[PDB]
Amino acid sequence: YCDSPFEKLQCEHLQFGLQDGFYSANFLDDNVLPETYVALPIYYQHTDINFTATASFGGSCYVCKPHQVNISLNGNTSVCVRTSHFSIRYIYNRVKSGSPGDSSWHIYLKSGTCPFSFSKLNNFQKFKTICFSTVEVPGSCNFPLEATWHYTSYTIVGALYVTWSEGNSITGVPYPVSGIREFSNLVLNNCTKYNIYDYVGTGIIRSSNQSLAGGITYVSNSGNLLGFKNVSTGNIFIVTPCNQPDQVAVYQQSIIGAMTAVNESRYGLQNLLQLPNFYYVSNGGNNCTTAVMTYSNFGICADGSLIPVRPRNSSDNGISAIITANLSIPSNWTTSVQV
Amino acid sequence: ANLSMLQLGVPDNSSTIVTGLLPTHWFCANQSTSVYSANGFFYIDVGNHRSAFALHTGYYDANQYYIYVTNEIGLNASVTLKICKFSRSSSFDCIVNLLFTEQLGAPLGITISGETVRLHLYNVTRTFYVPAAYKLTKLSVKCYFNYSCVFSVVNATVTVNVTTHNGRVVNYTVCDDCNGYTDNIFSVQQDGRIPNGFPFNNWFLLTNGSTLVDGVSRLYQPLRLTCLWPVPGLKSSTGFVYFNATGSDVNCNGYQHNSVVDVMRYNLNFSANSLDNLKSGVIVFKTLQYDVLFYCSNSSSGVLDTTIPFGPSSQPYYCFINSTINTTHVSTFVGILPPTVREIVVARTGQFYINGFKYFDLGFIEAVNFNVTTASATDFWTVAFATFVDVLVNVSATNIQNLL
Amino acid sequence: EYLQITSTPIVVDCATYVCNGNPRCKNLLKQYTSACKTIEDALRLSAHLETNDVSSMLTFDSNAFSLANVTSFGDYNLSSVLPQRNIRSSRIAGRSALEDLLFSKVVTSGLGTVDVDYKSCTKGLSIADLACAQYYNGIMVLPGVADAERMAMYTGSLIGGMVLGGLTSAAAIPFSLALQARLNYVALQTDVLQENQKILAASFNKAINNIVASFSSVNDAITQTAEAIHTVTIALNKIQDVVNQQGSALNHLTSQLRHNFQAISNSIQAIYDRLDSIQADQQVDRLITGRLAALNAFVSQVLNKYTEVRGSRRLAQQKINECVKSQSNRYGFCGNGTH
Amino acid sequence: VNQQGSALNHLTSQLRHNFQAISNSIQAIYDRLDSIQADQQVDRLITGRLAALNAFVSQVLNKYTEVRGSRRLAQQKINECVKSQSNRYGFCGNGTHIFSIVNSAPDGLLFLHTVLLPTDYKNVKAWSGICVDGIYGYVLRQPNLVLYSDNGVFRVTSRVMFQPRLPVLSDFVQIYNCNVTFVNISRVELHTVI
Ligand SMILES: *[C@@H]1O[C@H](CO)[C@@H](O[C@@H]2O[C@H](CO)[C@@H](O[C@@H]3O[C@H](CO[C@H]4O[C@H](CO)[C@@H](O)[C@H](O[C@H]5O[C@H](CO)[C@@H](O)[C@H](O)[C@@H]5O)[C@@H]4O)[C@@H](O)[C@H](O[C@H]4O[C@H](CO)[C@@H](O)[C@H](O)[C@@H]4O[C@H]4O[C@H](CO)[C@@H](O)[C@H](O)[C@@H]4O[C@H]4O[C@H](CO)[C@@H](O)[C@H](O)[C@@H]4O)[C@@H]3O)[C@H](O)[C@H]2NC(C)=O)[C@H](O)[C@H]1NC(C)=O
Ligand SMILES: *[C@@H]1O[C@H](CO)[C@@H](O[C@@H]2O[C@H](CO)[C@@H](O[C@@H]3O[C@H](CO[C@H]4O[C@H](CO)[C@@H](O)[C@H](O)[C@@H]4O)[C@@H](O)[C@H](O[C@H]4O[C@H](CO)[C@@H](O)[C@H](O)[C@@H]4O[C@H]4O[C@H](CO)[C@@H](O)[C@H](O)[C@@H]4O)[C@@H]3O)[C@H](O)[C@H]2NC(C)=O)[C@H](O)[C@H]1NC(C)=O
Ligand SMILES: *[C@@H]1O[C@H](CO)[C@@H](O[C@@H]2O[C@H](CO)[C@@H](O[C@@H]3O[C@H](CO)[C@@H](O)[C@H](O[C@H]4O[C@H](CO)[C@@H](O)[C@H](O)[C@@H]4O)[C@@H]3O)[C@H](O)[C@H]2NC(C)=O)[C@H](O)[C@H]1NC(C)=O
Ligand SMILES: *[C@@H]1O[C@H](CO)[C@@H](O[C@@H]2O[C@H](CO)[C@@H](O[C@@H]3O[C@H](CO)[C@@H](O)[C@H](O[C@H]4O[C@H](CO)[C@@H](O)[C@H](O)[C@@H]4O)[C@@H]3O)[C@H](O)[C@H]2NC(C)=O)[C@H](O)[C@H]1NC(C)=O
Ligand SMILES: *[C@@H]1O[C@H](CO)[C@@H](O[C@@H]2O[C@H](CO)[C@@H](O[C@@H]3O[C@H](CO)[C@@H](O)[C@H](O)[C@@H]3O)[C@H](O)[C@H]2NC(C)=O)[C@H](O)[C@H]1NC(C)=O
Ligand SMILES: *[C@@H]1O[C@H](CO)[C@@H](O[C@@H]2O[C@H](CO)[C@@H](O[C@@H]3O[C@H](CO)[C@@H](O)[C@H](O)[C@@H]3O)[C@H](O)[C@H]2NC(C)=O)[C@H](O)[C@H]1NC(C)=O
Ligand SMILES: *[C@@H]1O[C@H](CO)[C@@H](O[C@@H]2O[C@H](CO)[C@@H](O)[C@H](O)[C@H]2NC(C)=O)[C@H](O)[C@H]1NC(C)=O
Ligand SMILES: *[C@@H]1O[C@H](CO)[C@@H](O[C@@H]2O[C@H](CO)[C@@H](O)[C@H](O)[C@H]2NC(C)=O)[C@H](O)[C@H]1NC(C)=O
Ligand SMILES: *[C@@H]1O[C@H](CO)[C@@H](O[C@@H]2O[C@H](CO)[C@@H](O)[C@H](O)[C@H]2NC(C)=O)[C@H](O)[C@H]1NC(C)=O
Ligand SMILES: *[C@@H]1O[C@H](CO)[C@@H](O[C@@H]2O[C@H](CO)[C@@H](O)[C@H](O)[C@H]2NC(C)=O)[C@H](O)[C@H]1NC(C)=O
Ligand SMILES: *[C@@H]1O[C@H](CO)[C@@H](O[C@@H]2O[C@H](CO)[C@@H](O)[C@H](O)[C@H]2NC(C)=O)[C@H](O)[C@H]1NC(C)=O
Ligand SMILES: *[C@@H]1O[C@H](CO)[C@@H](O[C@@H]2O[C@H](CO)[C@@H](O)[C@H](O)[C@H]2NC(C)=O)[C@H](O)[C@H]1NC(C)=O
Numbered sequence A: 001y002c003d004s005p006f007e008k009l010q011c012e013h014l015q016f017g018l019q020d021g022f023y024s025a026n027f028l029d030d031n032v033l034p035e036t037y038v039a040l041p042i043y044y045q046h047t048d049i050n051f052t053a054t055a056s057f058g059g060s061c062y063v064c065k066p067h068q069v070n071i072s073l074n075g076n077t078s079v080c081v082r083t084s085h086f087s088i089r090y091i092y093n094r095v096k097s098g099s100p101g102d103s104s105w106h107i108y109l110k111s112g113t114c115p116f117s118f119s120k121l122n123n124f125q126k127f128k129t130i131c132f133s134t135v136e137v138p139g140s141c142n143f144p145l146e147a148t149w150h151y152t153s154y155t156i157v158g159a160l161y162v163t164w165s166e167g168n169s170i171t172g173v174p175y176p177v178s179g180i181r182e183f184s185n186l187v188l189n190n191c192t193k194y195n196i197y198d199y200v201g202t203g204i205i206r207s208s209n210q211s212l213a214g215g216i217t218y219v220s221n222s223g224n225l226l227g228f229k230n231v232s233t234g235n236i237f238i239v240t241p242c243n244q245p246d247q248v249a250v251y252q253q254s255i256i257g258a259m260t261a262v263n264e265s266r267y268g269l270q271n272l273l274q275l276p277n278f279y280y281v282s283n284g285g286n287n288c289t290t291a292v293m294t295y296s297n298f299g300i301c302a303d304g305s306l307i308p309v310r311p312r313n314s315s316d317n318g319i320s321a322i323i324t325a326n327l328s329i330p331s332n333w334t335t336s337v338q339v
Numbered sequence B: 001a002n003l004s005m006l007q008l009g010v011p012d013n014s015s016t017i018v019t020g021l022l023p024t025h026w027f028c029a030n031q032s033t034s035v036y037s038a039n040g041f042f043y044i045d046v047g048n049h050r051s052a053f054a055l056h057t058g059y060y061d062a063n064q065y066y067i068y069v070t071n072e073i074g075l076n077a078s079v080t081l082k083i084c085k086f087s088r089s090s091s092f093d094c095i096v097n098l099l100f101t102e103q104l105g106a107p108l109g110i111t112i113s114g115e116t117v118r119l120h121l122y123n124v125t126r127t128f129y130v131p132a133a134y135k136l137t138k139l140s141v142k143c144y145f146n147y148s149c150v151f152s153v154v155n156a157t158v159t160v161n162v163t164t165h166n167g168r169v170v171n172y173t174v175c176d177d178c179n180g181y182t183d184n185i186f187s188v189q190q191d192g193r194i195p196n197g198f199p200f201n202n203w204f205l206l207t208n209g210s211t212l213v214d215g216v217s218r219l220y221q222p223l224r225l226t227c228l229w230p231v232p233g234l235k236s237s238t239g240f241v242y243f244n245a246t247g248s249d250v251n252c253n254g255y256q257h258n259s260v261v262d263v264m265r266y267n268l269n270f271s272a273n274s275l276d277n278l279k280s281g282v283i284v285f286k287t288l289q290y291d292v293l294f295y296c297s298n299s300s301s302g303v304l305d306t307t308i309p310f311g312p313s314s315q316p317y318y319c320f321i322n323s324t325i326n327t328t329h330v331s332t333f334v335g336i337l338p339p340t341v342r343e344i345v346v347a348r349t350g351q352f353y354i355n356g357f358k359y360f361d362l363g364f365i366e367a368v369n370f371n372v373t374t375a376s377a378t379d380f381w382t383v384a385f386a387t388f389v390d391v392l393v394n395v396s397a398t399n400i401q402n403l404l
Numbered sequence C: 001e002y003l004q005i006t007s008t009p010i011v012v013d014c015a016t017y018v019c020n021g022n023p024r025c026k027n028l029l030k031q032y033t034s035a036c037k038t039i040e041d042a043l044r045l046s047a048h049l050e051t052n053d054v055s056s057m058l059t060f061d062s063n064a065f066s067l068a069n070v071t072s073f074g075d076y077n078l079s080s081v082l083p084q085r086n087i088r089s090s091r092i093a094g095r096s097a098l099e100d101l102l103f104s105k106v107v108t109s110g111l112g113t114v115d116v117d118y119k120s121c122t123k124g125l126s127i128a129d130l131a132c133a134q135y136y137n138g139i140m141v142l143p144g145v146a147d148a149e150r151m152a153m154y155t156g157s158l159i160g161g162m163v164l165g166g167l168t169s170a171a172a173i174p175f176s177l178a179l180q181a182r183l184n185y186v187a188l189q190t191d192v193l194q195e196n197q198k199i200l201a202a203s204f205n206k207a208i209n210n211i212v213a214s215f216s217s218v219n220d221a222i223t224q225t226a227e228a229i230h231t232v233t234i235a236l237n238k239i240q241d242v243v244n245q246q247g248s249a250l251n252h253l254t255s256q257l258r259h260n261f262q263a264i265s266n267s268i269q270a271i272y273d274r275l276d277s278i279q280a281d282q283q284v285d286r287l288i289t290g291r292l293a294a295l296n297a298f299v300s301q302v303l304n305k306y307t308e309v310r311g312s313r314r315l316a317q318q319k320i321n322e323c324v325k326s327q328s329n330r331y332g333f334c335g336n337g338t339h
Numbered sequence D: 001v002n003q004q005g006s007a008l009n010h011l012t013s014q015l016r017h018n019f020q021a022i023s024n025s026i027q028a029i030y031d032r033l034d035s036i037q038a039d040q041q042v043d044r045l046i047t048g049r050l051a052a053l054n055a056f057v058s059q060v061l062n063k064y065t066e067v068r069g070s071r072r073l074a075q076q077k078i079n080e081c082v083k084s085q086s087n088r089y090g091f092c093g094n095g096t097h098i099f100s101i102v103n104s105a106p107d108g109l110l111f112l113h114t115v116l117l118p119t120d121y122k123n124v125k126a127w128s129g130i131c132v133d134g135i136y137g138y139v140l141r142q143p144n145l146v147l148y149s150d151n152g153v154f155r156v157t158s159r160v161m162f163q164p165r166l167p168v169l170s171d172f173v174q175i176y177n178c179n180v181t182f183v184n185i186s187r188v189e190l191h192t193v194i
């Protein structure tokens, strides 16, 4: 079982029991994150699209096939998108007989040949035109529709046909916020999932104050954001990731100390020094006198404390010179063997 | 002030409007040391004396480029320009380090705009790209009026009316009028170029797809003019415009080549009011078969209104198209205006751009009637004609910094 | 003459570089665990093998160190070479008067290899530096072993060993007599009046001052004086070349994250916002393969660099053993004349 | 030995990685697809495996070049310490060389140097020359000898080991005019020194 802070290293490295030395560690967390969206100025205009399916049963056998299924978009057979924002749902009607006889039948969509998914069009996907339909049109992919009875036998009932073209005009939206004249959102101070000028990632967004005239997007040479700027003012913002890797020392099948970069306590350890280019977190004593592992310029001792490394002593005498004084000339000798 | 024609870029036997960094007033001083604040200098020397001019900041640095000019008059004008790093006069990295033999009796000069160092030399105009050269604000002058050395100091962005007659600059007058002309009017150089140091106020990049944000990138854009018609004052009784500057009302500015063009860049004059910026009228095109009528309104049942907003707005407008094919009036929907309408571009091969984005596409356009009813003439800044060329653009925040 | 004895230790994190912070690549990298343990072990072994060999040289002496003072060198002004004693801190000896004039040229232009502070890369409130922009991709620069102090104790132990004659316990012969023993090795001096030492004292001080003024970057006035600039210019070019070649490897490793391979985009979060989970793994695999192929090509260069530096330390040990302590007589060795 | 093993353990392990194909087994493809459709799959495996072999060869050659660099130092040490008794300081051993013995090892040689180390030393009242009658001065010819005084008896020894003997005439030269810090002695009692 992986609950304790040493057992999680064994879960990470896929190994029972670990050799002594320095190991890396970065424990991610799965969670649900809020979402921000900042884009160039444009007005707001919305449209809604359902996709219903209504069925009846009882022909000659139940388990073989349903009796009749109807498919419709908003009551029509085709709907084109002429506005700037949209959103799609999927609705299955179980109240056909009043009592839901549809409690056993499971009707749902599959994934067809389209290069995107149906349940992820409501995210911030950008197109040029779409024009959904439910009858056959040349040059169009499809999402099949499947029916079954307690997941024993499968059958195909209908489809959903969709065309498109690439662009940057029409954008999906999760849910129709009403009253806002210009759609944007911004969530500060803890980890989000941003979509800022068509850059997508995660991180923490903070506010600052610097006097930089020029661009509205600051990137590194690997394609990540470092900071953007609001248009109608001069304030900038800072974007940093919220998972920093570490260095963990392992000895005698336990954790001794860590080399962190965050000023707080960490995995089971309490005390905290402050070295000239990181923070060191351990819980040992301060009376140790001998070292068991090494790093750049110190030695981690047996219980966690730090010992600096001393240079080797060496004595030497120079070239004797012509002088009227007292000198030192060697008399006795011994041997030694070197390899 | 009597410069050449090549130092100002005007034609022969005309009267233009020139904007930019231009000299205004001469000095006559003998104080032998003065720290000014400036962006340039002109001077005239005939006197046998050392005369040295130097631009610098207010503190010494070991990674800054300094400009240093020294005249040593012999039989001609011996000028030594040295844009070099210094070591407390130990030059060790020189972008330029030259020696010019110049005609006596002709003034020289340096101006700075951005990271660009111009160089006026009475016969050419040479251009250097010094890194981090916007910081050079101060000016140290070693010039003596007793040895017949006079000099002027350039502050900023003067609007000058210039009159020429047979290669001789006759008049030279500074506008105490001419508000706002420093950002929208210029004079066309040789071979239809656009002069350096012009802040592109409403000059957008055109596109069929996405919009660029930042970075340096080659393009293919309409930036070679053949005319420019400043302050047109178009009315309800002007007529059509036929894609060439050979009519009866066209008053071009600077050079004027006769050719056939591709686009017509309009430019909109708008104030911070949102009540006087609501102009009433249509736009009438002229295709090969039938006329196309464009207008905008604020309700989706657009049968009761005809307006076009300028500048900033407060609620969305909807824009339509009429046509007529044998008493069968046809209407359609095109899109929404952006929140600030600034520029309208019409090409010959059908297309129609608003702030650099294509809305619709006709077949073939011959003339445009911009029919707006107004009680004044103050609606437009300029109307330009252009052709496609190959450029290199420094885009910053969806605008243009430089042009090459 | 300049030599090189060390390089800069690099330790790379695996999962941060390949799939930055996304907990869906952590499932897909489990099938390549044996393919990325061997990357980290190959770096953490060589970074230790350099440390042992560098700390094997740098000894220390105490009786020779106390004779490193400017009052024990006669008429020879040697004050711009000896280490500065007290910096009003907890330091035995700081840097010399010449080392700072070296470090003022090229270290401030390094910006990504020297004394990087990791404590301030996790606060925000600023657009990130170039050195902190690489720590967000796992690349960490360890400290070296030879700091400002040990290179001031090893060097002062050799300069002080000149005047240490072969007397009793700790007496020091004058330095004007310590050159008498180094000239009789050439030929027997049969002049009872030291007439040569006046001209040698008059020439050596000007020879020191011209070299000290040569590193001051005032170059064009001293270039046409003599041929002392011809020896210094090559050393300055080599010192600059080392720093440029250390920077250009990391500037090329980081820059291969912009290149998407045959996929949709180079951002891993951008794929999971668009496709289903069964369709996205084929896309993510094409990025994982190329990034591992980049890391292997980085390691296979770092190892050859370490082998070249191991080749270059031996010549430095030989010259320390034969010219500083011995006065060799091999022609074409230390200097082009009579040593 | 570890660096020799880890190269082959990495070359063999790149056969598990299929490239953008169906599977990493070539027999598994021809059991499934037709012959006209399978060659496009097999080509993607062939390309990657040739790209692996070239990267193996380009490492083996550098290893051979390093070993060619390392044999020369072994030939020099065999030529200079086993057969010659060199006198270069900081060479074989960190002291005074005597001899050396060789044995073999896994892929290489193993040297056994033999040096000397001092334990005791003596205190010696040195001098620097003899000045007879204020004019004529005598000093030692060779610069590796010391003239000293064991309380009225003058002897000459080396500067590296302590081996005393008596001074003779063939060790002295004549260097006129007598620096001050010599031994004042007249010509009559010179035979008590030499
Ligand atoms: C192509 O387009 C480009 C995009 O626009 C364009 O580059 C941009 O050029 C402008 C210059 O006009 C840069 O503007 C900034 O301006 C700041 C404000 O100060 C100046 O600007 C005012 C208006 O011009 C002046 O009024 C003002 O005077 C006032 O202030 C004075 C000082 O207080 C005072 O004495 C006066 O009396 C008056 O009160 C002043 O003239 C300015 O602060 C800013 O600083 C930069 O320069 C400093 C010194 O070099 C640095 O300390 C500072 O950090 C900035 O340098 C950064 O950028 C350089 C170039 O990019 C790098 O070489 C530096 O190393 C440093 O880069 C670091 O930081 C970056 C983020 O800032 C980061 O991304 C890097 O990785 C690195 O870590 C600056 O002058 C504008 O910044 C430029 N754009 C960019 C992106 O840099 C370019 O010119 C066009 N090409 C051509 C050929 O024209
Ligand atoms: C968004 O996307 C659209 C996509 O259509 C794009 O529109 C197209 O723009 C181009 C650019 O103008 C149009 O292409 C032609 O451009 C030439 C430019 O001339 C160059 O080449 C000639 C010869 O090489 C040189 O002389 C000249 O100096 C330039 O180097 C124009 O000359 C073309 O005009 C022709 O038609 C006129 C009317 O018929 C004639 O008067 C004219 O002389 C040209 O005729 C010549 O070409 C004909 C082609 O068949 C030929 O039949 C004739 O005999 C004669 O040789 C034309 O403008 C292209 O047409 C546009 N597309 C459409 C469908 O019209 C937009 O540019 C793009 N947006 C942005 C911002 O890029
Ligand atoms: C682009 O459009 C702008 C729209 O504002 C336009 O600016 C205006 O131009 C006129 C001249 O064309 C300016 O001058 C005014 O002219 C009338 C004529 O009688 C005067 O009465 C005005 O005086 C009033 O306004 C003064 C300034 O507020 C007051 O001090 C005075 O007491 C009067 O109330 C005035 O002189 C007018 O000022 C500007 N508007 C603004 C806001 O500046 C501009 O001309 C157009 N551009 C081009 C090239 O046509
Ligand atoms: C051995 O050589 C070293 C270096 O070659 C030498 O050290 C130098 O000593 C001189 C003085 O003896 C220093 O010069 C002074 O430095 C201070 C530092 O701030 C300056 O302020 C001084 O300027 C004043 O004095 C000048 C001359 O009187 C005036 O012209 C001036 O206006 C100021 O009033 C002056 O330059 C020099 O800095 C050091 N060098 C270093 C590197 O520290 C040492 O003296 C030599 N020793 C022997 C025994 O020869
Ligand atoms: C890293 O975090 C630690 C917290 O564990 C910081 O240590 C604390 O720092 C403060 C100020 O530097 C010390 O003073 C205290 O301040 C508070 C608030 O002003 C005050 O109420 C207290 O009376 C006290 O004066 C505090 O003692 C110290 N904590 C401990 C346990 O010593 C540390 O400063 C942080 N490092 C950096 C670089 O920010
Ligand atoms: C061998 O004998 C000679 C002469 O007998 C010694 O030479 C002279 O030695 C003295 C002192 O040792 C030197 O110093 C002088 O001392 C007097 C004070 O008495 C002082 O007034 C002088 O100014 C000077 O300092 C003297 O210079 C020296 N004579 C000469 C010509 O140099 C010599 O020292 C004896 N050898 C030894 C080892 O003592
Ligand atoms: C699917 O659509 C058909 C077509 O309208 C529906 O059939 C109609 O059902 C109503 C209800 O009994 C009848 O009054 C009509 O006469 C039917 N139309 C025809 C042409 O026969 C059918 O009911 C729908 N399916 C479901 C489950 O409601
Ligand atoms: C099972 O039988 C009951 C009653 O016999 C059904 O309940 C009603 O059936 C009628 C006719 O089918 C519907 O109009 C009513 O709406 C039903 N009542 C409710 C509360 O919904 C029941 O539907 C039958 N189950 C089926 C057909 O699956
Ligand atoms: C620090 O450690 C040293 C040894 O590592 C301790 O010295 C001895 O410790 C043992 C057990 O702690 C005692 O029995 C001895 O009497 C100690 N000897 C001396 C000379 O002190 C020392 O006590 C430790 N100090 C502290 C404060 O814990
Ligand atoms: C080297 O010699 C010194 C003194 O000759 C030894 O003495 C001290 O040891 C402590 C213990 O760490 C150090 O903090 C002191 O700095 C040392 N003194 C001096 C003057 O350096 C020392 O233990 C010997 N050994 C080593 C490895 O340094
Ligand atoms: C050189 O050594 C001799 C003895 O080997 C020293 O003579 C002794 O000096 C001490 C001074 O501390 C006296 O206490 C002794 O009585 C002396 N002994 C003898 C036998 O003379 C001499 O001082 C040393 N130094 C010099 C410069 O000669
Ligand atoms: C300028 O272009 C126009 C249209 O292409 C040319 O045609 C005439 O222009 C005048 C006024 O500009 C009109 O009154 C005529 O009706 C136009 N004729 C036709 C047939 O459209 C005009 O010739 C061109 N100018 C020059 C100098 O060539």
Ligand SMILES: *[C@@H]1O[C@H](CO)[C@@H](O[C@@H]2O[C@H](CO)[C@@H](O)[C@H](O)[C@H]2NC(C)=O)[C@H](O)[C@H]1NC(C)=O
Residues within 6 Å of the ligand: B236, B281, B284, B369, B371, B372, B373
């Ligand atoms: C340009 O606009 C003006 C003003 O809107 C138009 O002039 C009007 O034309 C209609 C047409 O019957 C007349 O009823 C009005 O009396 C006119 N008004 C004025 C003030 O003259 C003109 O027709 C438009 N031109 C075009 C080509 O559409």
Ligand SMILES: *[C@@H]1O[C@H](CO)[C@@H](O[C@@H]2O[C@H](CO)[C@@H](O)[C@H](O)[C@H]2NC(C)=O)[C@H](O)[C@H]1NC(C)=O
Residues within 6 Å of the ligand: C068, C069, C070, C071, C082, C083, C084, C085, C086
């Ligand atoms: C050389 O010796 C002198 C002794 O005169 C040292 O000078 C002392 O240095 C310490 C260092 O903190 C000061 O506290 C003393 O005040 C100094 N005394 C005098 C008289 O100047 C000098 O530091 C030594 N040099 C070196 C390099 O060690």
Ligand SMILES: *[C@@H]1O[C@H](CO)[C@@H](O)[C@H](O)[C@H]1NC(C)=O
Residues within 6 Å of the ligand: A074, A075, A076, A077
């Ligand atoms: C489309 O649906 C609407 C109801 O939303 C209906 O009024 C209209 O008649 C339908 N049109 C067609 C062609 O089915």
Ligand SMILES: *[C@@H]1O[C@H](CO)[C@@H](O)[C@H](O)[C@H]1NC(C)=O
Residues within 6 Å of the ligand: A034, A189, A190, A191
């Ligand atoms: C983090 O974000 C959540 C959003 O659900 C918010 O409720 C909370 O206040 C934020 N801050 C902290 C410290 O949890």
Ligand SMILES: *[C@@H]1O[C@H](CO)[C@@H](O)[C@H](O)[C@H]1NC(C)=O
Residues within 6 Å of the ligand: A208, A209
């Ligand atoms: C502005 O910058 C200063 C610099 O220290 C900082 O303390 C402050 O928090 C920043 N923000 C505001 C709103 O002042």
Ligand SMILES: *[C@@H]1O[C@H](CO)[C@@H](O)[C@H](O)[C@H]1NC(C)=O
Residues within 6 Å of the ligand: B024, B025, B153, B154, B155
């Ligand atoms: C330049 O500007 C200064 C103040 O900015 C002003 O005093 C001076 O008169 C200007 N120069 C001229 C020639 O007007």
Ligand SMILES: *[C@@H]1O[C@H](CO)[C@@H](O)[C@H](O)[C@H]1NC(C)=O
Residues within 6 Å of the ligand: B015, B161, B162, B163
């Ligand atoms: C410029 O000067 C000419 C010459 O008199 C004049 O006709 C013209 O109107 C002037 N321009 C302006 C804008 O005043």
